[PDB]
Amino acid sequence: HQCVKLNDGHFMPVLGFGTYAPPEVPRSKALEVTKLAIEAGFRHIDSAHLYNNEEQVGLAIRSKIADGSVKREDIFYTSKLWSTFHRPELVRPALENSLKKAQLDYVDLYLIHSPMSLKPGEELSPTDENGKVIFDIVDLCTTWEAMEKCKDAGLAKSIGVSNFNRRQLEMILNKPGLKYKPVCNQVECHPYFNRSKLLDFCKSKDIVLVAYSALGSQRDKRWVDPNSPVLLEDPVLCALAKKHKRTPALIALRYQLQRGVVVLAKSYNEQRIRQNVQVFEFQLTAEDMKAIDGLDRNLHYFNSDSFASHPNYPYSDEY
């Protein structure tokens, strides 16, 4: 196992456990599989208000601390501010609510989940009389200032963003009176959308790029086009898996580790959870890495097409 030093001095494990499951999956499963992830050796756990599972992920962490399996300081726990809470006065209460649900005193990392602000309220997806999601206009620099106060108050050890493009990152980085840079930008990133340009920008600013959907997403019909290619069926990934006597998933994860990306992996399957930790057991050659670099096709599993008219839609730019 390994960590990366963040630009605020804290350390983030380079392999993280993804916890999202669709609402049809019983919440008891998130409890069970987070315990299995910790037993397998995951120390970085990625949750969010949106996932409706912080209560269970927190219970799993509590249970493994009481086991003597880990200490709280050994676990890197991420939560995320949902887009209906971007107005600055709502940020600290949202974080406090997440902490209360997880029964934790602090999160290791708090992220702005998305730059696309939504109408404030308890509903996650507020909609108007014609069924359209109601956007909000919020200066994300004021949201960031509220995030900074959460770090000063000790409720988040580190703060970062998610789904930001380069221009959106620069707006934070160029903010007058900035106190804390975002430590990371959690974005969709895999061999079919490898974010090389955004990665280079983040590296130049000492911002860690954290990859989600690194195994090609859960392909839920509600949010992912069923005709998109399946990442783990890719011939190059499968040929490399055979060459290294690994699996295409492990190739996809190891690819990110070797280009300096922190990688998340969701699994609710005991054997695949344990398999994913084997990413540390082998290395891709330089030739292998160039072959995978060749797979990019700017394919967004989470394209959020119905939000393409949002002013902060991140894919309005080249990157």
Ligand SMILES: NC(=O)c1ccc[n+]([C@@H]2O[C@H](COP(=O)([O-])OP(=O)(O)OC[C@H]3O[C@@H](n4cnc5c(N)ncnc54)[C@H](OP(=O)(O)O)[C@@H]3O)[C@@H](O)[C@H]2O)c1
């Ligand atoms: N910031 C954001 O907006 C955002 C957006 C998307 C995701 N995320 C985070 O990133 C996490 C991961 O992304 P994701 O949920 O899209 O899924 P993912 O990591 O890309 O995984 C996709 C699928 O791969 C399967 N899988 C896992 N290990 C495997 C293996 N060794 N061999 C074959 N298949 C394997 C899993 O199925 P099984 O469960 O059946 O094993 C999973 O459903 C999420 O859970 C969430 O924490 C954040």
Ligand SMILES: CCOc1ccc2c(c1)C[C@H](C(=O)N(C)Cc1cc(C(=O)O)c(C)o1)CO2
């Ligand atoms: C601010 C943007 O505006 C909105 C408004 C409503 C809305 C969304 C975005 C996105 C939601 C969605 O895509 N869900 C729940 C599937 C999913 C999310 C994640 C994750 O990890 O994040 C994963 C792995 O899957 C749908 O509900």
